[PDB]
Short mmCIF file of C-alpha atoms in Angstrom, two decimals:
data_model
loop_
_atom_site.label_atom_id
_atom_site.label_comp_id
_atom_site.label_asym_id
_atom_site.label_seq_id
_atom_site.Cartn_x
_atom_site.Cartn_y
_atom_site.Cartn_z
CA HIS A 1 9.00 30.32 -15.21
CA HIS A 2 11.94 30.55 -12.84
CA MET A 3 13.39 28.92 -9.79
CA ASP A 4 15.69 30.04 -7.02
CA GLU A 5 19.28 28.91 -7.11
CA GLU A 6 19.07 26.58 -4.13
CA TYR A 7 16.55 24.80 -1.92
CA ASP A 8 17.01 22.30 0.90
CA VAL A 9 14.44 19.93 -0.59
CA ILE A 10 12.81 19.65 -4.01
CA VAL A 11 9.51 17.75 -4.23
CA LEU A 12 8.15 16.43 -7.58
CA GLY A 13 4.49 15.60 -7.83
CA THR A 14 1.46 16.70 -5.77
CA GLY A 15 0.10 13.32 -4.84
CA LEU A 16 -0.93 13.02 -1.24
CA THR A 17 2.34 11.41 -0.01
CA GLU A 18 4.45 14.15 -1.56
CA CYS A 19 2.19 16.94 -0.18
CA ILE A 20 2.29 15.59 3.36
CA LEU A 21 6.09 15.17 3.31
CA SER A 22 6.48 18.65 1.80
CA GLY A 23 4.35 20.11 4.54
CA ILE A 24 6.36 18.31 7.25
CA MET A 25 9.61 19.63 5.75
CA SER A 26 8.23 23.17 5.64
CA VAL A 27 7.01 23.09 9.23
CA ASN A 28 10.41 21.65 10.23
CA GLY A 29 12.19 24.67 8.77
CA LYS A 30 13.36 23.51 5.34
CA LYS A 31 13.41 25.65 2.25
CA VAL A 32 11.19 23.64 -0.12
CA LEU A 33 10.55 23.81 -3.84
CA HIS A 34 7.42 21.84 -4.80
CA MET A 35 6.70 21.32 -8.51
CA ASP A 36 4.45 19.17 -10.73
CA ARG A 37 4.63 18.66 -14.50
CA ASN A 38 0.80 18.46 -14.54
CA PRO A 39 -1.61 21.40 -14.77
CA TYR A 40 -3.66 19.99 -11.84
CA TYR A 41 -2.97 18.75 -8.32
CA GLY A 42 -3.00 15.15 -7.00
CA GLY A 43 -0.84 13.16 -9.38
CA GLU A 44 -2.41 9.73 -9.51
CA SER A 45 -4.52 10.66 -6.46
CA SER A 46 -6.30 13.50 -8.40
CA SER A 47 -9.83 14.83 -7.98
CA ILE A 48 -11.92 15.43 -11.09
CA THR A 49 -14.43 18.25 -11.47
CA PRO A 50 -16.82 19.05 -13.03
CA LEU A 51 -18.54 15.78 -13.91
CA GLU A 52 -18.21 16.47 -17.64
CA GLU A 53 -14.40 16.13 -17.19
CA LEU A 54 -14.81 12.71 -15.63
CA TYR A 55 -16.81 11.52 -18.66
CA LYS A 56 -14.20 12.95 -21.01
CA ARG A 57 -11.31 11.27 -19.12
CA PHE A 58 -13.04 7.89 -19.47
CA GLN A 59 -13.79 8.53 -23.18
CA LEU A 60 -17.57 8.92 -22.77
CA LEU A 61 -18.40 11.51 -25.44
CA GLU A 62 -22.11 11.22 -24.59
CA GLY A 63 -21.50 13.35 -21.46
CA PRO A 64 -23.47 13.04 -18.27
CA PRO A 65 -27.27 12.90 -18.56
CA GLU A 66 -29.46 15.60 -17.05
CA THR A 67 -30.37 13.34 -14.23
CA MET A 68 -26.75 13.47 -12.96
CA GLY A 69 -27.49 16.96 -11.78
CA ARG A 70 -25.23 20.01 -11.62
CA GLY A 71 -21.85 19.05 -12.96
CA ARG A 72 -19.81 21.46 -10.86
CA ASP A 73 -21.19 19.79 -7.73
CA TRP A 74 -19.14 16.66 -8.42
CA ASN A 75 -15.61 16.27 -6.98
CA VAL A 76 -14.56 12.74 -7.94
CA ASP A 77 -11.39 11.36 -6.42
CA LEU A 78 -9.75 8.77 -8.65
CA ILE A 79 -8.26 7.05 -5.58
CA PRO A 80 -10.61 7.66 -2.67
CA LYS A 81 -9.49 6.43 0.76
CA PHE A 82 -10.75 7.07 4.30
CA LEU A 83 -8.76 8.20 7.37
CA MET A 84 -8.93 6.35 10.69
CA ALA A 85 -9.83 9.20 13.05
CA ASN A 86 -7.23 8.40 15.74
CA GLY A 87 -4.68 7.13 13.23
CA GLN A 88 -1.19 8.40 12.52
CA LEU A 89 -2.07 10.04 9.17
CA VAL A 90 -4.42 12.44 11.04
CA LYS A 91 -1.65 13.05 13.61
CA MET A 92 0.77 14.02 10.83
CA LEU A 93 -1.87 16.30 9.33
CA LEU A 94 -2.35 17.97 12.76
CA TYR A 95 1.42 18.40 13.15
CA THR A 96 1.55 20.33 9.94
CA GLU A 97 -1.65 22.26 10.82
CA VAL A 98 -3.07 21.73 7.31
CA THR A 99 -6.14 20.71 9.36
CA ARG A 100 -6.90 24.45 9.59
CA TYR A 101 -8.10 24.11 5.97
CA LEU A 102 -10.04 20.81 6.04
CA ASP A 103 -13.56 19.91 7.01
CA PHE A 104 -13.53 16.22 7.86
CA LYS A 105 -16.97 14.61 8.15
CA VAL A 106 -17.59 11.24 9.78
CA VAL A 107 -18.31 8.36 7.37
CA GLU A 108 -21.70 6.99 8.35
CA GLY A 109 -21.25 3.25 8.02
CA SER A 110 -18.71 0.47 8.16
CA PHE A 111 -19.48 -2.97 6.75
CA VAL A 112 -17.89 -6.34 5.96
CA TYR A 113 -18.88 -9.09 3.53
CA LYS A 114 -19.46 -12.58 4.92
CA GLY A 115 -21.16 -15.49 3.11
CA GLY A 116 -22.76 -13.42 0.36
CA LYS A 117 -24.06 -10.50 2.43
CA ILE A 118 -22.72 -7.38 4.13
CA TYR A 119 -22.99 -6.65 7.84
CA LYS A 120 -22.11 -3.81 10.21
CA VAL A 121 -18.59 -4.23 11.63
CA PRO A 122 -19.00 -4.69 15.40
CA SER A 123 -16.41 -3.06 17.63
CA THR A 124 -18.11 -2.73 21.00
CA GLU A 125 -19.59 -5.32 23.32
CA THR A 126 -23.10 -3.99 22.58
CA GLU A 127 -22.63 -4.21 18.74
CA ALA A 128 -21.27 -7.75 19.18
CA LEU A 129 -24.43 -8.87 20.96
CA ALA A 130 -26.65 -7.29 18.28
CA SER A 131 -24.64 -8.56 15.33
CA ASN A 132 -26.06 -10.90 12.67
CA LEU A 133 -22.51 -11.79 11.58
CA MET A 134 -22.36 -14.55 14.17
CA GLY A 135 -24.71 -17.00 15.80
CA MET A 136 -25.84 -16.76 19.40
CA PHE A 137 -22.96 -18.62 21.02
CA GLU A 138 -20.13 -17.21 18.88
CA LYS A 139 -21.29 -13.62 19.23
CA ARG A 140 -21.02 -14.02 23.02
CA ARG A 141 -17.48 -15.39 22.63
CA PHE A 142 -16.70 -12.40 20.41
CA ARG A 143 -18.13 -10.08 23.06
CA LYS A 144 -15.66 -11.62 25.52
CA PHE A 145 -12.83 -11.14 23.04
CA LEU A 146 -13.74 -7.43 22.62
CA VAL A 147 -13.85 -7.01 26.41
CA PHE A 148 -10.35 -8.53 26.58
CA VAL A 149 -9.04 -6.16 23.92
CA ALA A 150 -10.63 -3.10 25.50
CA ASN A 151 -9.32 -3.92 28.99
CA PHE A 152 -5.85 -4.83 27.74
CA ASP A 153 -3.12 -2.55 29.15
CA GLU A 154 0.47 -3.16 28.11
CA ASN A 155 1.71 -2.16 31.54
CA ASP A 156 -0.48 -4.49 33.56
CA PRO A 157 0.12 -8.22 33.12
CA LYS A 158 -3.18 -9.11 34.87
CA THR A 159 -4.98 -7.77 31.80
CA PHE A 160 -3.00 -10.10 29.52
CA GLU A 161 -5.11 -13.11 30.60
CA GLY A 162 -2.00 -15.26 30.43
CA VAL A 163 -0.88 -14.22 26.94
CA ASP A 164 2.60 -12.83 26.29
CA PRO A 165 2.01 -9.76 24.09
CA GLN A 166 5.53 -10.06 22.67
CA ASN A 167 5.35 -13.75 21.71
CA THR A 168 1.83 -15.31 21.81
CA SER A 169 0.55 -15.32 18.26
CA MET A 170 -2.77 -13.76 17.32
CA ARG A 171 -3.81 -17.23 16.05
CA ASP A 172 -3.45 -18.43 19.65
CA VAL A 173 -5.39 -15.45 21.01
CA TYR A 174 -8.28 -16.25 18.64
CA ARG A 175 -8.08 -19.91 19.83
CA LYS A 176 -8.43 -18.71 23.43
CA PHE A 177 -11.95 -17.39 22.45
CA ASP A 178 -12.64 -20.27 20.05
CA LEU A 179 -13.28 -17.85 17.16
CA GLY A 180 -13.95 -19.46 13.80
CA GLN A 181 -12.49 -18.65 10.45
CA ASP A 182 -15.29 -16.24 9.41
CA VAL A 183 -14.81 -14.18 12.59
CA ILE A 184 -11.07 -14.16 12.09
CA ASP A 185 -11.66 -12.88 8.52
CA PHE A 186 -13.69 -9.86 9.59
CA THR A 187 -11.58 -9.17 12.67
CA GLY A 188 -8.26 -9.16 10.86
CA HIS A 189 -9.43 -7.41 7.70
CA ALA A 190 -12.26 -5.12 8.80
CA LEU A 191 -11.26 -4.23 12.40
CA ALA A 192 -7.45 -4.46 12.32
CA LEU A 193 -7.32 -3.47 8.59
CA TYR A 194 -4.68 -5.97 7.54
CA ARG A 195 -4.38 -6.84 3.87
CA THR A 196 -3.21 -10.40 4.56
CA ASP A 197 -3.26 -13.03 7.27
CA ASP A 198 0.51 -12.90 7.99
CA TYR A 199 -0.34 -11.35 11.37
CA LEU A 200 -1.83 -14.65 12.53
CA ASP A 201 1.58 -16.17 13.24
CA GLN A 202 3.09 -12.94 14.64
CA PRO A 203 2.93 -11.56 18.19
CA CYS A 204 -0.49 -10.43 19.23
CA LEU A 205 0.34 -6.94 20.61
CA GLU A 206 0.23 -5.10 17.29
CA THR A 207 -3.13 -6.65 16.40
CA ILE A 208 -4.67 -5.86 19.79
CA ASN A 209 -3.51 -2.28 19.28
CA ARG A 210 -5.03 -2.09 15.84
CA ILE A 211 -8.39 -3.28 17.12
CA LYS A 212 -8.18 -0.72 19.96
CA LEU A 213 -7.54 1.97 17.36
CA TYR A 214 -10.73 1.10 15.54
CA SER A 215 -12.94 1.00 18.64
CA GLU A 216 -11.47 4.20 20.06
CA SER A 217 -11.80 6.18 16.79
CA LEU A 218 -14.87 8.43 16.86
CA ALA A 219 -18.42 7.49 16.98
CA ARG A 220 -21.61 9.32 17.76
CA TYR A 221 -24.73 7.18 18.20
CA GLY A 222 -22.98 4.44 16.27
CA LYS A 223 -21.08 5.85 13.36
CA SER A 224 -17.82 4.61 11.84
CA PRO A 225 -14.20 5.38 12.85
CA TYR A 226 -13.46 6.89 9.44
CA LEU A 227 -13.18 10.47 8.27
CA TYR A 228 -13.37 11.90 4.72
CA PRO A 229 -13.09 15.61 3.81
CA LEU A 230 -15.97 17.62 2.52
CA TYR A 231 -15.28 18.18 -1.21
CA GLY A 232 -13.03 15.08 -1.23
CA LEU A 233 -9.31 14.46 -1.07
CA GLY A 234 -8.49 17.24 -3.54
CA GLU A 235 -8.79 19.50 -0.50
CA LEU A 236 -5.45 18.08 0.81
CA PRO A 237 -3.17 19.32 -2.01
CA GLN A 238 -5.06 22.64 -1.97
CA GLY A 239 -4.52 22.95 1.80
CA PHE A 240 -0.85 21.98 1.54
CA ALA A 241 -0.27 24.51 -1.22
CA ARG A 242 -1.75 27.19 1.07
CA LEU A 243 0.40 26.01 4.00
CA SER A 244 3.49 25.99 1.83
CA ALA A 245 2.83 29.64 0.94
CA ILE A 246 2.72 30.63 4.59
CA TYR A 247 6.22 29.25 5.05
CA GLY A 248 7.42 30.96 1.89
CA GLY A 249 7.04 28.42 -0.83
CA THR A 250 4.53 28.49 -3.71
CA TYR A 251 3.69 25.17 -5.39
CA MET A 252 4.51 25.27 -9.12
CA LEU A 253 2.13 23.42 -11.48
CA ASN A 254 2.53 22.78 -15.19
CA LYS A 255 6.31 22.69 -14.65
CA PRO A 256 8.21 20.01 -16.65
CA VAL A 257 11.22 18.25 -15.12
CA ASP A 258 13.83 17.94 -17.81
CA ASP A 259 16.50 16.17 -15.71
CA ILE A 260 17.32 15.07 -12.17
CA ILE A 261 20.96 15.94 -11.97
CA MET A 262 23.20 13.43 -10.28
CA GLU A 263 26.89 13.69 -9.49
CA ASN A 264 28.95 10.81 -8.00
CA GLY A 265 25.69 9.01 -7.44
CA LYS A 266 24.00 11.80 -5.38
CA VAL A 267 21.36 14.32 -6.42
CA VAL A 268 22.56 17.85 -6.66
CA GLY A 269 19.55 19.53 -8.44
CA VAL A 270 16.75 19.62 -10.95
CA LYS A 271 16.65 21.09 -14.44
CA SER A 272 13.45 22.75 -15.54
CA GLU A 273 12.86 25.04 -18.54
CA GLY A 274 16.50 25.92 -19.04
CA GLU A 275 17.35 26.47 -15.40
CA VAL A 276 18.91 24.30 -12.64
CA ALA A 277 17.75 24.68 -9.00
CA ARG A 278 20.20 22.85 -6.49
CA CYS A 279 19.00 20.72 -3.61
CA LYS A 280 20.31 18.46 -0.89
CA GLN A 281 17.39 16.00 -1.05
CA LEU A 282 14.71 15.18 -3.58
CA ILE A 283 11.25 13.66 -2.95
CA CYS A 284 9.16 12.32 -5.88
CA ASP A 285 6.60 9.82 -7.13
CA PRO A 286 7.58 6.89 -9.39
CA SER A 287 6.67 8.71 -12.59
CA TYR A 288 9.71 10.93 -12.15
CA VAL A 289 12.25 8.09 -11.73
CA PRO A 290 11.40 5.00 -13.87
CA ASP A 291 14.91 3.60 -13.42
CA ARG A 292 14.61 3.72 -9.62
CA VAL A 293 11.39 1.68 -9.33
CA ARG A 294 10.03 -1.82 -9.91
CA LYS A 295 6.44 -2.84 -10.61
CA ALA A 296 4.70 -4.37 -7.62
CA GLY A 297 1.41 -5.42 -9.34
CA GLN A 298 -1.68 -3.81 -10.79
CA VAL A 299 -4.89 -2.42 -9.29
CA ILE A 300 -8.36 -2.10 -10.81
CA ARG A 301 -10.75 0.62 -9.61
CA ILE A 302 -14.33 0.94 -10.84
CA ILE A 303 -16.08 4.20 -9.96
CA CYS A 304 -19.85 3.57 -9.85
CA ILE A 305 -22.45 6.33 -9.82
CA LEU A 306 -25.64 5.33 -8.04
CA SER A 307 -29.06 6.98 -7.58
CA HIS A 308 -29.68 5.02 -4.39
CA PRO A 309 -27.93 4.21 -1.10
CA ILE A 310 -26.31 0.80 -1.03
CA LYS A 311 -28.74 -1.96 -0.08
CA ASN A 312 -28.31 -3.37 3.49
CA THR A 313 -26.54 -0.27 4.86
CA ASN A 314 -29.52 1.38 6.59
CA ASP A 315 -29.52 4.15 3.96
CA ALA A 316 -25.97 5.24 4.82
CA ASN A 317 -24.90 8.42 3.05
CA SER A 318 -21.23 7.22 3.13
CA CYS A 319 -19.65 3.88 4.02
CA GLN A 320 -16.67 1.54 4.06
CA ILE A 321 -17.10 -2.02 2.81
CA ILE A 322 -14.35 -4.65 3.22
CA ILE A 323 -14.55 -7.94 1.25
CA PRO A 324 -11.96 -10.27 2.82
CA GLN A 325 -10.19 -12.35 0.15
CA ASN A 326 -11.06 -15.69 1.74
CA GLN A 327 -14.79 -14.95 1.42
CA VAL A 328 -14.47 -14.72 -2.38
CA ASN A 329 -11.79 -17.29 -3.23
CA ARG A 330 -9.02 -14.81 -4.03
CA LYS A 331 -5.55 -13.82 -2.85
CA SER A 332 -6.35 -10.10 -2.33
CA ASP A 333 -9.22 -8.25 -0.66
CA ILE A 334 -11.88 -6.28 -2.53
CA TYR A 335 -12.80 -2.82 -1.19
CA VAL A 336 -15.77 -0.50 -1.74
CA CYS A 337 -15.83 3.00 -0.36
CA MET A 338 -18.86 5.17 -0.91
CA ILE A 339 -19.28 8.91 -0.52
CA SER A 340 -22.16 11.07 -1.79
CA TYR A 341 -23.79 14.48 -1.85
CA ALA A 342 -23.52 14.40 1.95
CA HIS A 343 -19.76 14.93 1.62
CA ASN A 344 -20.26 17.49 -1.17
CA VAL A 345 -18.63 15.24 -3.83
CA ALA A 346 -21.75 14.44 -5.92
CA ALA A 347 -24.90 16.25 -7.00
CA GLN A 348 -27.88 16.06 -4.67
CA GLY A 349 -29.31 12.59 -4.48
CA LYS A 350 -26.28 10.88 -6.09
CA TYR A 351 -23.76 8.42 -4.63
CA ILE A 352 -20.21 7.44 -5.70
CA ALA A 353 -19.22 3.86 -4.82
CA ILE A 354 -15.65 2.93 -5.80
CA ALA A 355 -14.70 -0.73 -5.98
CA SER A 356 -11.03 -1.81 -5.99
CA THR A 357 -8.79 -4.85 -5.85
CA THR A 358 -5.37 -6.14 -6.90
CA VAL A 359 -5.44 -7.77 -10.34
CA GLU A 360 -5.05 -11.57 -10.29
CA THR A 361 -6.56 -12.62 -13.64
CA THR A 362 -6.77 -11.66 -17.30
CA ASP A 363 -10.38 -10.31 -16.75
CA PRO A 364 -9.92 -7.71 -14.02
CA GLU A 365 -13.48 -6.39 -14.33
CA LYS A 366 -14.88 -9.86 -13.65
CA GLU A 367 -12.81 -9.97 -10.45
CA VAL A 368 -14.76 -7.05 -8.97
CA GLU A 369 -18.21 -8.60 -9.65
CA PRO A 370 -18.77 -9.53 -5.93
CA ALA A 371 -18.50 -5.83 -5.14
CA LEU A 372 -20.55 -4.62 -8.10
CA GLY A 373 -23.39 -6.96 -7.24
CA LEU A 374 -23.80 -5.13 -3.94
CA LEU A 375 -24.33 -1.83 -5.80
CA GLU A 376 -26.67 -2.66 -8.68
CA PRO A 377 -28.35 -0.89 -10.26
CA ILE A 378 -25.40 1.27 -11.32
CA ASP A 379 -26.03 4.39 -13.43
CA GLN A 380 -22.50 4.59 -14.85
CA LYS A 381 -19.15 2.83 -14.38
CA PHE A 382 -15.69 4.29 -14.95
CA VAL A 383 -12.98 1.58 -15.12
CA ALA A 384 -9.26 2.23 -14.55
CA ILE A 385 -6.36 -0.24 -14.31
CA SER A 386 -3.18 1.14 -12.73
CA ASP A 387 0.35 -0.23 -12.43
CA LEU A 388 1.88 -0.14 -8.95
CA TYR A 389 5.50 0.92 -8.45
CA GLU A 390 7.91 0.82 -5.48
CA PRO A 391 11.46 2.19 -5.28
CA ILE A 392 14.47 -0.04 -5.66
CA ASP A 393 16.59 2.71 -4.11
CA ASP A 394 15.91 3.87 -0.51
CA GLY A 395 17.83 7.08 -1.11
CA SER A 396 20.49 6.56 1.53
CA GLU A 397 23.24 7.17 -1.04
CA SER A 398 21.34 8.95 -3.85
CA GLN A 399 19.31 11.29 -1.60
CA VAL A 400 16.44 10.64 -4.00
CA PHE A 401 13.37 9.59 -1.97
CA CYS A 402 10.63 7.98 -4.11
CA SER A 403 7.13 7.06 -2.90
CA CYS A 404 5.11 3.97 -3.56
CA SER A 405 2.02 3.99 -5.74
CA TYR A 406 -1.34 3.89 -3.94
CA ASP A 407 -2.59 0.35 -3.35
CA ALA A 408 -6.20 -0.92 -3.61
CA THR A 409 -7.03 -0.36 0.08
CA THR A 410 -9.71 2.23 0.83
CA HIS A 411 -7.97 3.59 3.95
CA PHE A 412 -4.72 5.37 4.61
CA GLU A 413 -2.70 2.88 6.73
CA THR A 414 -0.36 1.75 3.97
CA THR A 415 0.06 5.35 2.69
CA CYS A 416 0.93 6.47 6.21
CA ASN A 417 3.51 3.67 6.40
CA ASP A 418 5.14 4.88 3.21
CA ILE A 419 5.23 8.47 4.48
CA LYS A 420 6.82 7.34 7.76
CA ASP A 421 9.35 5.20 5.94
CA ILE A 422 10.39 8.00 3.56
CA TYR A 423 10.67 10.49 6.46
CA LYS A 424 12.98 8.06 8.31
CA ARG A 425 15.14 7.57 5.20
CA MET A 426 15.39 11.36 4.83
CA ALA A 427 15.94 12.45 8.41
CA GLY A 428 17.98 9.51 9.69
CA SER A 429 15.48 8.76 12.43
CA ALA A 430 11.78 7.98 12.80
CA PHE A 431 9.02 10.51 12.86
CA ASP A 432 8.75 11.06 16.59
CA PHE A 433 5.13 10.78 17.58
#
């Protein structure tokens, strides 16, 4: 196979981050080469089909039983995550117009674990007053808090209720409504989607905005703010490869990268199968540049096939479940996202629930037991432990722009942050929304 002599940008890997940045560069007028050493799309964020290939990948020579249904009807993302409907990832997708090729379907449910049990996440005053997450008095204080957040308007100090959005901490806002620790857990982790409680001692504006984002994103009759594509996240690399073609570039799979050529500390090209392609800038995932990354931790994901909807979700055909770390005596949250035949990722009547967390012990499977217990009985588990990498080079000098590995969260916020950060490093200014 052959390459042109020169491109503006070379992209290595077809993980989601690389595909989105490639698409932005194409729509912005760059000449892009996009390659992958693998014979399949997604990099680490790859989608497996048919089901027999999933069994083989996890070394299950027994193959799927009959009862798993038609194998070709399974599209199993290794790293499933949901999109906040009004979030910036969707805005970037719209900018590129890759959305022409995707069928997002609303995720039915959104839940949070509290004291042993899962509950619907309440984001409207009506939901607050029906919620079993809180007792009678506290749910009415929470209703008042939601009314404050909804009415808040950065340009009208009357709506601040005496808080300074730029300086009053979110801890002090919660104190204004006398919200207890359990409410703070679900609010911060399941409404605002933080990983940690660092926000508590930071100015409240960003948190208020995050809660607004949740409430404002979709619903219809009461469904979640989350989107997931029919056929799963493998539709994104496929859509981006089609978009790239329209602009004149064809994605190249099964294409080894022999060398990233550097001169005076700056990339000047890539060598592949006896040819050198020149470029001004290079985008890649960590696997292409081991000397330009450091390990940031490890994640465990357990894919669980079920023959039943998750208990206590009103028979949801898809759902988000957040397990805040303080509810389970850990230093990192546990996540479960579930998608099923309703999103055309499993055979009829089957469900895929994927549990994830950041490894903290020498028994990572044991760490996920609070999530698994919500799902039992489980037909089959598929366990994967992954190392996380982050660049130690921001590319300002090298012009080598490396992504971060995908973290344990089951939504795209931290992925979107990485994309925005890489864009800024590349362009010299922020993606202008």
